[PDB]
Amino acid sequence: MLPKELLDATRRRGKIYLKFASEEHFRLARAVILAFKSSVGQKYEDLQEKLRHMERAENYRKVRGFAKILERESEFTTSSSLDPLEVRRFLFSRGYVTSEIERAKIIAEAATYFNTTPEEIERAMFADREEEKILTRVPGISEEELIRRYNLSLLQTLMFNSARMSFRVSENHKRIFRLIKLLGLMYEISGENIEITGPASILKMTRKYGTSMAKLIPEIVKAKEWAIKAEIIEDKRVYFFELSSEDDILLPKLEVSVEYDSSLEREFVTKIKRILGVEVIREPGIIKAGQYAYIPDFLIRKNGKEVYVEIAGFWTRSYIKSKLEKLSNVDVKMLIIVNDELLADKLGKIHDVIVMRKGKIPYKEVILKLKEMLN
Amino acid sequence: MLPKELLDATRRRGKIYLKFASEEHFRLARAVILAFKSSVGQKYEDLQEKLRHMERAENYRKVRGFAKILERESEFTTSSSLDPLEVRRFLFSRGYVTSEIERAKIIAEAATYFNTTPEEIERAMFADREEEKILTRVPGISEEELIRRYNLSLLQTLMFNSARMSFRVSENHKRIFRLIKLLGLMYEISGENIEITGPASILKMTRKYGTSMAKLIPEIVKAKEWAIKAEIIEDKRVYFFELSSEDDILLPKLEVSVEYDSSLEREFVTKIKRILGVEVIREPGIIKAGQYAYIPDFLIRKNGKEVYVEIAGFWTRSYIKSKLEKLSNVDVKMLIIVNDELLADKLGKIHDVIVMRKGKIPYKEVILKLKEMLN
Questions:
Q1: Which top-rank group of organisms is this from (chains A, B) (predicted)?
Q2: Which of A56, A162, B57, B203 is 20 to 30 A distant from B247 in Cα terms?
Q3: From CA A172, how far away is CA B342, in angstroms rounded?
Q4: Do B314 and B170 share a structural domain?
């Protein structure tokens, strides 16, 4: 997101700061709301011209950013009951493109065929263009909520260029750990500090990973106390970013779920249990190993031995190799399964982990490794 | 069989013409090729700077288009044997981002950890940037081949804005008809004229559809004689385009291959044979019905009665309703199956066709319909 970086952040002495909106921007937020309200019943093109007219060097980014929020929560509709594709099909089959003088006549024939007026045909002809969509509903969002959502969006946008983002929260740890796993994030826990590998630390799937990462931020800033630190890469330059609840930035408290099902969990247990003669506990709980903590998917036990199993999300070779070294100096035994469709990195020799095939777990390989680990 | 490009066209009085390259652009092609050859061993940024320097107002689209063709056929490599993600993980974990004053020290530690020099650490650190990839191999392409490939890419690019493209070829009809089906194109055949609905006539999947349509063009222009006509939409403006082999545009002769699975096909044959007790012929010939011709997927024969079955590719409600109307009161009996995953249009009530469910054929519906047609 180049534009935002060069324009809604400031860089100084190796640090990067975001140009958050505050109560000082109340009048600007209201002016954007008024531009949307005035454009109800009009084409998106007319709304955009209103926004361009109010834009000045000083307010340009916030006008754009506020309007992006309102547009996302607004309802647009096509301007005609007619199908634009069927209208154009009819017109083009009667020679519309190869005519010039005859076009008004061809439009009049269409109006008879579709039981309407020439003006309705003309409205329908290109009604599938985005510029032609009609604003029909504007959300009932206050200036303050607009400013809060803009600031959350800005914080999320910055994290698309993060090499790593670390945070602490005063509560909601259980939900956050569940979110990290559902979102497939690369994580590291040390004490109260939770470090998320960012998209500037992967080779591919950057937008997909960054989008997933961004869904975690609304849950962080909902805690009564929280602190974020991040390392940001911009071309060959690096910057340190830091924000906490004590900075009193206006931010929302948005509902976050992005939930799932326990189908694989049950499928995995049912496939391993009697085959292996083993006890399996699903989501057994955070396990501490040395100075680090892990969020395993399964605990597998037989005789007096134990093996934790964790299914990674997005991954790179450097991330998995680092995780493996950290687990090698500790008593816990852990089997990591990595998905080949989530490799955000070059293909390489990675041992000690089990690799999926086309997104499916290889159960015989898992069974044999587990047998070897459990004896 | 496509690389995207910048359009470069002339528009005049409702007609659009492409700015094809010719022998007049030989010296420019030679200069672009030399910029690549003289950059082997250098970084992508250094190559691009040579191209920026040679660009002028009148030729920048060809400089950039020629270079894009060469780049796609060139080989680039990362500048060190080190994994940049691993190097940055090491550097950043030692405080690289937060202690500018220690960076030379931290880089020297990395050089010891990775068994190399500080200068290699500095090369590897941001070696995953596109600007820093090294040009290692340039294709042996000639100025004439570059001009031919540019012209094909230009013609292909224009069709991304086509509402429809119609063509005639003097030979290779069977291969062209097979390709139309393999590519999932919306087609209509009338005598020698083959009309392809273009991506300006669908609401979504426009990149996917236009890319598929682009792959048909190399097969058209390989015929001894050919002629293309198209209707082009740009915003709310329409243009007529026409080109034939008689215009003597320099074009390539490319081998065209599209990978096909055919798994759904085989299962359809076996199930219908068993449940219906009929003969099922895969990929029968082209069939004429009225003034139009069709490329069916199956012919089902029972006690002398015959029913054709066609599985559409990409589709719109407009296209399918027009197709159904042309089939309406013709002798031949044809059943159309559409795939819900290939609808490039709004959801609507379409009847007289069978709609797949999550890309799977509904066999009860198909069999019952076939029985009604087979009696």
A1: Archaea
A2: B57
A3: 42
A4: no
